[PDB]
Amino acid sequence: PRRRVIGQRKILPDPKFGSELLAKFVNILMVDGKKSTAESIVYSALETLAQRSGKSELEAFEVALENVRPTVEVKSRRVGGSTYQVPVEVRPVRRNALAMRWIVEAARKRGDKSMALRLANELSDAAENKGTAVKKREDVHRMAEANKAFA
Amino acid sequence: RKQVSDGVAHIHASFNNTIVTITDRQGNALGWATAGGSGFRGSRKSTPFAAQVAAERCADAVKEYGIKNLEVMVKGPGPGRESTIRALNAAGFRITNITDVTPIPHNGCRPPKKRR
Amino acid sequence: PVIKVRENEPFDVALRRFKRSCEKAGVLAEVRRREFYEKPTTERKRAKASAVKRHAKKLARENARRTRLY
RNA sequence: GCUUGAGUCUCGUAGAGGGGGGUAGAAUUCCAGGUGUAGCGGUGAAAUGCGUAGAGAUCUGGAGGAAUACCGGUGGCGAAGGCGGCCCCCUGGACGAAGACUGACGCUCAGGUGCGAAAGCGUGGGGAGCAAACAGGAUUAGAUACCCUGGUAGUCCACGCCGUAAACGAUGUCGACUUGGAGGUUGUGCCCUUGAGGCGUGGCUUCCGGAGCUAACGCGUUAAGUCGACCGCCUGGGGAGUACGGCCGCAAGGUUAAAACUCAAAUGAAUUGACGGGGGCCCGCACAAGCGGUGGAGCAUGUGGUUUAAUUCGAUGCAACGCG
Ligand SMILES: [Mg+2]
Ligand SMILES: [Mg+2]
Ligand SMILES: [Mg+2]
Ligand SMILES: [Mg+2]
Ligand SMILES: [Mg+2]
Ligand SMILES: [Mg+2]
Ligand SMILES: [Mg+2]
Ligand SMILES: [Mg+2]
Ligand SMILES: [Mg+2]
Ligand SMILES: [Mg+2]
Ligand SMILES: [Mg+2]
Ligand SMILES: [Mg+2]
Ligand SMILES: [Mg+2]
Ligand SMILES: [Mg+2]
């Protein structure tokens, strides 16, 4: 809004691991207001991720986040005939939300069988620094680097 | 070649570009680099950052001569008036002195007509 | 606006002193002023218009000195 | 006769006042070279244009024409137009102090005469920059415009002509009188210049306001106040500062200057709104940040159309169209 300043809501942590960073992930991944069928997708893909490679389920997820977080991004503004794109820094809370949105959105485009399997593949590629959720991070970093003159 | 020790940096700042030329103390040019030739064609070469890269590339291309001291001679207005000099220190040169040369007529020739 | 860098000095001190020398000399104002031709009748009108503002705005704050706002 | 108007003489002061002749520095452009490489220039974005025959940049040498940064100031001078580097020659006006002198010699002025920006004209020179016309590139529905790249007359000089400008404080010249304040600039008198001081007196000028005047806005000791002398001009809007005639001009054209016809208005200042691709402040799922849709497919339903014996009537920008 233009007048008020709003304090963020409180989010209950997930039952299995008690971590609020994952509790948002099942919120972002959930479509159609059904947490039960989404918490199953997140839990299955975390077990597939941990069993396949790495240590633990909470650190395996965190590593996938770290590669896909954006540290800089462009905010478009108009001046004359055309539009400019000044680069801006990302606040840490927005950095996380942008990371999980990119992971989920880039796991729905995979051609695998079940979303529990597409998600587990994507957290794997994000940790190993491949896939298309990390490509978007580099794309955003490029659009900020190509417009660095407009800072 | 010829191992020049003392040079002069000629920054031709303008409203539309920025040309950095490094010459010896006798005026002979040793190498140059502009802002628009640095991959900054269009409305990005006016920006002071595009002129910084010009100072970097012009710091190169004189590697062979091995200059160790630079006098900076800024000319004209424009964004690349400040960000070019500091990039000639961040490139490892020594700025002995800075002199501003600029053509200011004592009411000489008639300038062009006002834009509308 | 020639500035000579002294001995036992930093650089960012010198560059700030270069701007101060250039700002005091009005180099960029003169370059911007001489870019296009200003007709003599617009150079004289722009001078009297800016002196009228200098007089009124000084007398405007004087009439506002002897008031209470709340 | 007189000296309170007007003028003359003595001494100084300030000033882009005028005419002529020299000279200085910065900068633009061009010419001849050295170094040096692939871009330069321009724009909202581009392209035309210049460049590998080597531009742009940078240094050296030279030639040319025009204008005088800073000082510089609702500062100064001039009747108006106007006048800005520095020096010399010729020259006009103003002002101030103390005196001497002439003794109404004064004010205005139809015709008349002179001066009169810029553009323009003629003859002869000059030509850097800028730039009507012109050409190209863009923008555009079109763009014989604004924008960009070039560019001739002109802008400059000598001598003639033109004689008009929003030639404007839209306010004719001269004289007298009528509360104040803060400034600028330029002389002069008195005293503790004894110390960046204090008090008077003149000339010119910018601002704010009192009585008064004014339709109002506003003017207000430099009146648009209160009076006197002389001159110029006005008499509803359009036609029209036009036609014909006279004078002037090389020409462009200037000046003097109507009528038929036509309308009941045209106009000035102020007031309340509305509007603005004027300004400031603030708000709204207005945008920005996000989630899910419509526009495509099949069907339901409503409406325009066409059809029909009738396809009953109504609502039909937002604010009609799963509405009565
Ligand atoms: Mg231009
Ligand atoms: Mg007379
Ligand atoms: Mg007469
Ligand atoms: Mg003329
Ligand atoms: Mg001529
Ligand atoms: Mg001629
Ligand atoms: Mg007239
Ligand atoms: Mg005038
Ligand atoms: Mg008149
Ligand atoms: Mg007044
Ligand atoms: Mg006539
Ligand atoms: Mg006639
Ligand atoms: Mg459909
Ligand atoms: Mg119906």
Residue nearest to nucleotide D35 (CA to C1'): B28
Q: Which experimental method was this entry solved with?
A: cryo-EM
Question: Quick one: angle between helices A58-68 and A92-105, nearest 10?
Answer: 100
Ligand 14 center–CA B3 separation, angstroms: 96
B interface test, pick of C35, C39, C42, C46 with most B CB neighbours within 10 Å: C35
Of the candidates B82, B95, B104, which has its C-beta nearest C14's C-beta? Answer: B95
Q: CA separation (Å) from A81 to A84, A151, B42, B91, C48?
A: 10, 19, 14, 37, 36
Helix-, strand-, coil-residue percentages of chain C, each rounded to 5 = 65, 5, 30
Q: CA separation (Å) from A90 to A72, A85, A104, B60, C48?
A: 6, 15, 20, 34, 50
How far apart, in whole angstroms, are the C-alpha atoms of residue C32 and residue A52?
67
Closest C-alpha among A123, A120, A117, A116 to residue A100:
A123
Is the CB of residue A126 less than 8 Å from the CB of residue A62?
Answer: no
How far apart, in whole angstroms, are the C-alpha atoms of residue A48 and residue B90?
50
DSSP 3-state of B13: strand
How far apart, in whole angstroms, are the C-alpha atoms of residue B34 and residue B12?
9
Ligand 5 center–CA C44 separation, angstroms: 29
Is the CB of residue A133 less than 8 Å from the CB of residue A108?
Answer: no
Is the CB of residue A122 less than 8 Å from the CB of residue A94?
Answer: no
Angle value at C-alpha A62, between A57 and A63, nearest 5 degrees = 100
Could you say which DSSP state residue A107 is in? Answer: T
Residue with tokens 């706002």: C69
How far apart, in whole angstroms, are the C-alpha atoms of residue C61 and residue B39?
53
Closest C-alpha among A75, A122, A121 to residue A99:
A122
How far apart, in whole angstroms, are the C-alpha atoms of residue C16 and residue C24?
12
Closest C-alpha among B95, B15, B101, B100 to residue B51:
B15
Angle value at C-alpha B86, between A72 and A77, nearest 5 degrees = 35
Closest C-alpha among A150, A139, A136, A84 to residue A107:
A136
Angle value at C-alpha B63, between B61 and B65, nearest 5 degrees = 105
Is the CB of residue A38 less than 8 Å from the CB of residue A28?
Answer: no
How far apart, in whole angstroms, are the C-alpha atoms of residue C57 and residue C69?
19
Structure tokens at C48: 């009297």
The DSSP secondary structure of B19-70, one letter per residue, reads: EEEEEETTS-EEEEEESTTSS--STTSSSHHHHHHHHHHHHTT-TTTT--EE
Largest Cα separation within chain A, whole Å, is 55
How far apart, in whole angstroms, are the C-alpha atoms of residue B106 and residue C12?
33
- Decide: residue C17, CB within 10 A, 0-12 exposed, 13-18 middle, 19+ buried: middle
Cβ of residue B44 closer than 8 Å to a chain A Cβ? yes
Continuous segment of H or E residues that includes residue B73: strand B69-75
Closest C-alpha among A32, A68, A26, A62 to residue A44:
A26
Is the CB of residue A43 less than 8 Å from the CB of residue A35?
Answer: no
How far apart, in whole angstroms, are the C-alpha atoms of residue B33 and residue B42?
17
Task: Specify which residues A72 forms β-bridges with.
Answer: A89
Q: Do strands B69-75 and B95-100 pair parallel, antiparallel, or not at all (unpaired)? A: parallel
Ligand 11 center–CA C18 separation, angstroms: 66
| Alpha carbon of residue C45 to chain centroid | 19
Question: Quick one: angle between helices A35-52 and A115-127, nearest 10?
Answer: 50
Give C34's contacts in chain B (Cβ within 8 Å).
Answer: 104-105, 111
Give A149's contacts in chain B (Cβ within 8 Å).
Answer: 40, 44, 47-50
Q: Which nucleotide's C1' sits nearest to the alpha carbon of B26?
A: D59
Closest C-alpha among C6, C7, C21, C14 to residue B88:
C14
Is the CB of residue C22 less than 8 Å from the CB of residue B100?
Answer: yes
How many residues appear in chain A? 151
How far apart, in whole angstroms, are the C-alpha atoms of residue A11 and residue A27?
10
Residue with tokens 């250039």: C22
Determine if residue B110 is left, alpha or beta; phi over 0 gives left, psi from -120 to 50 gives alpha, anything else beta: beta
How far apart, in whole angstroms, are the C-alpha atoms of residue B67 and residue B84?
17
The resolution in Å comes to 3.2
First to last CA, chain B: 51
- Protein-covered nucleotides of chain D (CB closer than 7 Å) are 25-28, 34-46, 56-60, 65-70, 73-74, 128-131, 146-148, 206-208, 282-288, 290-292
Closest C-alpha among B81, B55, B53, B54 to residue B70:
B55
Tell me how crowded residue B30 is: count the other CB atoms within 10 A of its CB. Answer: 19
Which residues, other chains included, contact A61 with Cβ-Cβ below 8 Å and sequence gap of 6+? A21, A22, A25, A46, A49, A123
Which residues, other chains included, contact A91 with Cβ-Cβ below 8 Å and sequence gap of 6+? none
Structure tokens at A33: 């207001």
Is the CB of residue B64 less than 8 Å from the CB of residue B90?
Answer: no
Could you say which DSSP state residue A51 is in? Answer: H
Residue with tokens 């007398």: C59
